[PDB]
Amino acid sequence: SDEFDALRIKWATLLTGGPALDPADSDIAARTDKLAQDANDYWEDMDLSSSRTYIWYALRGNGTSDNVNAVYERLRTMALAATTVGSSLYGNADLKEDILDALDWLYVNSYNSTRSRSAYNWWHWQLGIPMSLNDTAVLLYDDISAARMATYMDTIDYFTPSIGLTGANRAWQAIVVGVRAVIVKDAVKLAAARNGLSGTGIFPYATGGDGFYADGSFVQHTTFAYTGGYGSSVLETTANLMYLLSGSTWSVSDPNQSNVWQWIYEAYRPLLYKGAMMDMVRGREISRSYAQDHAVGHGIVASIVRLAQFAPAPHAAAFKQIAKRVIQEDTFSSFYGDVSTDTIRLAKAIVDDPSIAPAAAPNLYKQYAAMDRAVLQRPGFALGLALYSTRISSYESINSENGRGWYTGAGATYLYNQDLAQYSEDYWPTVDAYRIPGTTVASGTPIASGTGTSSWTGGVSLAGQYGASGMDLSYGAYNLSARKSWFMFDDEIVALGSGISSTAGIPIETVVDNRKLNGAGDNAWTANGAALSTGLGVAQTLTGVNWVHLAGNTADGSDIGYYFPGGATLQTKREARTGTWKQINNRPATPSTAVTRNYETMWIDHGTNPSGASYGYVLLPNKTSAQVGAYAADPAIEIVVNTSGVQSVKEKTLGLVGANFWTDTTQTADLITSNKKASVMTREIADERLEASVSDPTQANNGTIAIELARSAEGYSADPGITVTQLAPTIKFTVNVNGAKGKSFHASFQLG
């Protein structure tokens, strides 16, 4: 033997689940049957003709990278069906033979050094195809000749001989070279793969461009929030590669590898809700039918389990606890149902281990300043907030994917409750893309893909417990500007809008919500205590409503209440919508099968060419119509100010006051006074203590923010960067936000 052989086998069991696999296992069996089925389902449809012009009729075209790549995965699947224990084709030599015949057939007929490393979608040629090829090599290593195994590895080394790209792509190169390095037994290349992990976009935090940030954000393609998309890939490949090298003379040494641990705690954990990976951080992938939020979540949790296999003691146990809690929480789609068999074996061992307790659920407010996102996690629900600015683009759409993502990150609110399927079950191809909840837009008209013109997008976090966010809106595709804010407290979220003006000559609207209902569309809902009709295809105007209650798709834990402080007039419609995935993802491999889902859509009509229009509403998750009614009578909320210059809301019961100052002029909101653009939040414990948090959301102030609180103090403690200059009669201090990059500064004052 030798290490190279031991590694190859470790990678084989990572793909197979090794000899240990227990087919008797209910979930392992299911995965196995499905494999064997799909596999031969192909095999018994291949063109085994000695003189074939293609291998699969539906995948003909040795020149279309998309099809070629697809035939390699096809093979890959057959290679696994012939290797995974419990498979209906385990051992079948003829299967193996056919696989190899097909391989060389493509060496001369398509994939070889005859092509350029530039051909459209170099990705397929340099990464995609060689990733499947390596795995086949590894699985069929034995059944392969010396020369045959050369036409394979030589061509791969051609397309991708070195590592030197960005994040996701760099990691793919790394595992592409690493894996082929162990099978070709080459220490130089293999050591190059280990070192690639230290490159930009991976281990080291990035202060610009692609990669992971210290605040836990993840960027790809320079301006897109992508933790759930490309981020997801970087996590998987890195975990897989680090696991292989782990324990060998090529093990990862770089001290930065520790950052990988934080990715889990800060970058992913807060963005997972009972199995789902929030769509707002998945980029254009939301348009992929095979990658909806829960499927994606499973892939991530799968990587957590992988990590737990070699991570240091403190972290590994933590990884097991988290994986266990997620696997148990997801009652929508079984985790074991869409992950590798080896992953099933490993997770099963964590879940049934009575010594491993599920980790507590996250309860917090996190401001991902570097990617314009924000999250609130509470016991019964979670809120995802997607914004954009001069730093982050509205949405991404390339290769004919996500053609309707216009408003996906333009002040969009995503509510997660017991209805775990809300954003799954073909939501994306059926939801009216022009009415994304939380947004303000010109009716039925889109916006362009790109970064905005305003720097003011971000928010403040009060000790990761509460927070407030804001977005200075100004579309480029058409005239419309507005000031939008959100204040997250304990059980409610207040959304405020002001300065809504436009000359576009198109009716402007703010969509309060657009929820997918049950299969019947009969969800009960009330307004001001009156039961409303539940029929499909009906559109009604609710005038002068103070509160609305919509019942969830689950018996408990998914109802949603809406309160309108000054009362309002809502435009609503409950309809059945039909659409296909091909409409938002025009690729050959995407399903054209039409699907129908039901929706209850509600919006505020601002009229045509409005000037200085405003709006205010509060989301009350998981409350009964009676609780919503009670709230609407004696509310815990009190709007302090909702102007073009400052938006502020107070939570009477918690003693919280949040405020977003939109201009560089002196303004005061309740007890708060600011001289510069800022996001501020305070908590007051009568005659005892006053807390304050401040941030410069613009990330452009290279001076300070002068704050003054209307209270008398006798002592204080503050984060560095804060200088207190007066404690009495009133509190005064400045915040050095030079290069703060959107972070929040905290200070606590003692009263008496």
Which residues of the chain form contacts with Ca ion (CB under 5 A)?
489, 491-492, 636
Is 600 labelled a binding residue? no
Closer to Ca ion at the Cβ: 363 or 541? 363
Closer to Ca ion at the Cβ: 472 or 492? 492
What residues form DSSP beta bridges with 619?
A: 493, 562
Altogether, the residues listed in the chain come to a count of 752
Is 711 labelled a binding residue? no
Cβ 304 to Ca ion shortest distance, Å:
33
The pair of three-digit structure tokens given for residue 45, joined into one six-digit string: 């449809």
Cβ 393 to Ca ion shortest distance, Å:
34
Closer to Ca ion at the Cβ: 342 or 559? 559
How far apart, in whole angstroms, are the C-alpha atoms of residue 658 and residue 457? 16
Position closest to Ca ion via CB: 636
Closest-CA residue to 267 (of 232, 319, 223): 232
* Lookup result for tokens 């683009």: 393
Instruction: Compute the half-sphere exposure of residue 108: CA atoms within 13 Å on the CB side of its CA.
Output: 7
How far apart, in whole angstroms, are the C-alpha atoms of residue 313 and residue 322? 14
Of the residues 72, 152, 226, 230, only one is catalytic, namely 230
CB neighbours of residue 175 within 10 Å: 24
Is 651 labelled a binding residue? yes
How distant is the alpha carbon of residue 174 from its chain centre? 24
The pair of three-digit structure tokens given for residue 647, joined into one six-digit string: 């938006």
Closest-CA residue to 96 (of 240, 112, 87, 177): 87
Closer to Ca ion at the Cβ: 330 or 491? 491
How far apart, in whole angstroms, are the C-alpha atoms of residue 279 and residue 231? 13
Is 330 labelled a binding residue? no
Cβ 491 to Ca ion shortest distance, Å:
5
How far apart, in whole angstroms, are the C-alpha atoms of residue 31 and residue 96? 20
How far apart, in whole angstroms, are the C-alpha atoms of residue 268 and residue 368? 12
Closer to Ca ion at the Cβ: 204 or 380? 380
Q: At what angle do helices 129-140 and 65-81 cross, to 10 degrees?
A: 20
Q: At what angle do helices 3-16 and 230-245 cross, to 10 degrees?
A: 140
Closer to Ca ion at the Cβ: 634 or 688? 634
Residues 6 or more apart whose Cβ sits within 8 Å of residue 250 = 187, 190, 191, 194
Is 514 labelled a binding residue? no
Which residue type, as a one-letter code, is found at position 445? T
Q: Are 378 and 363 in contact (CB under 8 A)?
A: yes
Cβ 385 to Ca ion shortest distance, Å:
18
Catalytic, 230? Answer: yes
Closer to Ca ion at the Cβ: 30 or 640? 640
The pair of three-digit structure tokens given for residue 374, joined into one six-digit string: 């924000």
The C-alpha angle with vertex 450 and arms to 444 and 451, in degrees rounded to 5, equals 115
Cβ 375 to Ca ion shortest distance, Å:
18
How far apart, in whole angstroms, are the C-alpha atoms of residue 387 and residue 368? 11
Is 123 labelled a binding residue? yes
Cβ 577 to Ca ion shortest distance, Å:
33
* Lookup result for tokens 């990691």: 171
How far apart, in whole angstroms, are the C-alpha atoms of residue 678 and residue 459? 8
Closer to Ca ion at the Cβ: 172 or 489? 489
Pairing of strands 689-695, 382-386: unpaired
Closer to Ca ion at the Cβ: 571 or 627? 627
What residues form DSSP beta bridges with 649?
A: 639, 658
Closer to Ca ion at the Cβ: 563 or 745? 563
Cβ 284 to Ca ion shortest distance, Å:
36
Instruction: Compute the half-sphere exposure of residue 53: CA atoms within 13 Å on the CB side of its CA.
Output: 5
Cβ 203 to Ca ion shortest distance, Å:
41
Closest-CA residue to 325 (of 274, 377, 366): 274
Closer to Ca ion at the Cβ: 492 or 509? 492
Is 284 labelled a binding residue? yes
* Lookup result for tokens 């010109």: 442
Cβ 291 to Ca ion shortest distance, Å:
36
DSSP code at position 55: S
How far apart, in whole angstroms, are the C-alpha atoms of residue 200 and residue 371? 17
Residues 6 or more apart whose Cβ sits within 8 Å of residue 460 = 367, 467, 468, 658, 678, 679, 680, 681, 693, 694, 695, 697, 744
Cβ 269 to Ca ion shortest distance, Å:
25
Is 261 labelled a binding residue? no
The pair of three-digit structure tokens given for residue 564, joined into one six-digit string: 């309108």
The pair of three-digit structure tokens given for residue 19, joined into one six-digit string: 């000899």
The pair of three-digit structure tokens given for residue 219, joined into one six-digit string: 């960027």
Longest dimension (CA), the chain: 93
> Which H or E run includes 238?
helix 230-245
Cβ 465 to Ca ion shortest distance, Å:
13
The pair of three-digit structure tokens given for residue 41, joined into one six-digit string: 């389902």
Is 122 labelled a binding residue? yes
In the annotated binding site for Ca(2+), the residues are 490-492, 651
Residues recognised as catalytic:
230
In the annotated binding site for xanthan, the residues are 121-123, 221, 230, 284, 288-290, 399, 587
In the annotated binding site, the residues are 121-123, 221, 230, 284, 288-290, 399, 490-492, 587, 651
